């Protein structure tokens, strides 16, 4: 049981705090989990609009999305379930999302149909780089990093060469592009 | 002193 509270704790915290990026859709489901957790069943009565600090439930960039309702349903759908059960079920969701476990780093992309920079969610795994929507988190594209041929990091951009699998680099805008590369580097290191 | 792991804290 502590050490469901240990894994809980952490998996809560990371998507509340962002560390952890994941859509509004899924981000009302944790909030019901928390709020079963938290509060125990759904009650009508105690339970109402207004109830809910919505600061201490969603994700910064979801608070002004008037998901309350969302939580509820949420919350409302727990049933009689137990703490211990919503916890379980709170870790085991965030394992299951593709952005669990990912370190990501907000970068910008420079693209057609206007000169403004697009912000965009870039993720490394050890076995993978991912292009992610800053807003719907949904992976746009995602590359092996067995097709990386080369890369380059200056203090105000990243690029990334796959040679022989697409046209042209991905390219994009970002202070990182050392603590990103030499992630990257140490994993492809550990592959061969 | 000592420093407990945490898998074996209680489930």
Redesign the interface.
Known sequence: ????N?LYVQARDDILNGSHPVSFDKACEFAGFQCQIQFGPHNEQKHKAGFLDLKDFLPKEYVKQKGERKIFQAHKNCGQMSEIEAKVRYVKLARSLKTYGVSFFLVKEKMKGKNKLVPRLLGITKECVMRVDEKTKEVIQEWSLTNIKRWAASPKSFTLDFGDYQDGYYSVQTTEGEQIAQLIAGYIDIIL | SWVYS??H???
């Open positions: 049981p502590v050490q469901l240990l | 945490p898998l804290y209680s489930a």
